[model samples]
Target chain A: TTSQKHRDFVAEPMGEKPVGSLAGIGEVLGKKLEERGFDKAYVVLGQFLVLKKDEDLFREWLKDTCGANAKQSRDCFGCLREWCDAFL
Target chain B: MTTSQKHRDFVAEPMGEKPVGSLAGIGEVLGKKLEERGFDKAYVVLGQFLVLKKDEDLFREWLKDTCGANAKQSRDCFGCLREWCDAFL
Candidate 1:
């Protein structure tokens, strides 16, 4: 089962939420992303869409951009993927 | 009074399968350039807009560089997308 954070994140429109609201992306990772110009959850979601919601590419990007570990990147990818399926 | 019909058309819907030219300020010429640059659809441009976090400045610069959109053209397109997101995203 996924965490509550995952459930909550995918359940809404994500309006103006900070990057930290994403699953598996906490304050540390969020700060890193913000510094690199991904200050908003929607911004990362934008990249996910640009990559056509590819699992491999998104996971790799999460890892490269914010140093997310295997589980972290996978969780983040799953969150965005589910959100897109439901909303996009 | 200043709204273009194209802007109204784009901001009025979910953007499903719309061509790049369907967006405001993107006529045949800029549309061709965006298509050649792999932004063939409105959603692709939306992806870029979202990636830029809806920042008008960055998005404007990107539009200028990517498809040679001038100031007025880029502003019109940006406003169109921003409104669409307000309605749909």
Candidate 2:
């Protein structure tokens, strides 16, 4: 299920769910995110939107702010962007 | 035409690329500092506001921590952001 994307991600309000619930977060990165203030997926999404969904900018900020690797950050950005389109 | 020029100017329209200096509490000094710290645009300040989850106290604390905005300055900026969010976000 490497490409699995749960319907629940867009089916709900996101309402402060743990960042790990995001599609790309998985376990390891989720733990890293939890250690930082971005315990919630929406918090990171806020940063994503604040960057105006600029892929390069969001990726760079994610990497700089939390040491997220390129692929991880890209996936995270894509997940958040899609979530915003559906919810925001 | 001084019926709260600051509030009116802020609420009258979309901020649309206005320099961070246009924010009520931001004055030249704080604006310069903010610009130097990568907040040259009002949208950038909005980014900080969202990051703080729109909490007034937290935002105030952040403003003070970031560029030494005084009580009035922070409140002004907070009010602007609050109003903007009400209308836009």
Candidate 3:
């Protein structure tokens, strides 16, 4: 089941926040992402858009970029994917 | 205005079937450039954003490389896509 916060966040729009705001992103991962120039959450969203929201590609990218675990990346990708389904 | 009319329309909802022309800062010239580059559709450009993973510099550089869009034009386009995603994605 989707967490209420997750549902709410995805249901609307994601403004400027850190990458860590995404589900499954923790301080460690978020900091790493920030170092890579993804300071704002929307910046990462831009990456997702560039990928055409492809689940496979996005998961692989998250893993490669920040070493996000399988479950962590999957959950994060799903959050973005569902958000796109509703709004994009 | 908060954003250009193009921005308003684009940010208001999903870009489902909107033409690339609907994008702010993408007038005839830039639109033509994008079209020639396999971005005939707005969704196609959106696909690039998804492909680029939405990095601002990367996307901005892409616009400049694809067309001769200046900083303002690039920013407008980026802002439009960013808002569109906010509203729709």
lDDT per residue for candidate 2 within B1-89, as digits (tens), equals 53357766876766767788888788999999988887888867877787777789999999999899999889989998778666644
Query: Which candidate ranks first by lDDT, i.e. highest?
Result: 1
Writing each residue's lDDT as its tens digit, candidate 2 over A31-68 gives 77777777877677768756766899988887776777
Write one digit per residue (lDDT tens) for candidate 1, span B35-55.
999888887898899998888
TM-score of each: 0.87, 0.61, 0.71
Error of 2 at A48 (Å): 4.3
Model 2: which docking level applies? Answer: acceptable
RMSD of each: 2.0, 5.2, 4.1
Predictions in order: lDDT: 0.88, 0.75, 0.77
After superposition, the stretches of candidate 1 with alpha carbons farther than 4 Å from their true spots are none
What C-alpha root-mean-square deviation, in Å, does candidate 3 show against the real structure?
4.1
lDDT per residue as tens, model 3, A42-62: 666666765656689888988
Q: CA lDDT of B73 in candidate 1?
A: 96
**Chain A superposition TM-score, candidate 3:** 0.88
Candidate 1, residues A1-88: lDDT per residue as tens digits?
7999999999987888889889999888989999999998889988887776778988899889999999888888889888866765
Task: Give interface RMSD, per candidate.
Answer: 1.5, 4.6, 3.8
Query: Could you tell me the TM-score of candidate 3?
Result: 0.71
User: Which stretches of model 3 miss by more than 4 angstroms?
Assistant: B1-8, B35-61, B70-89
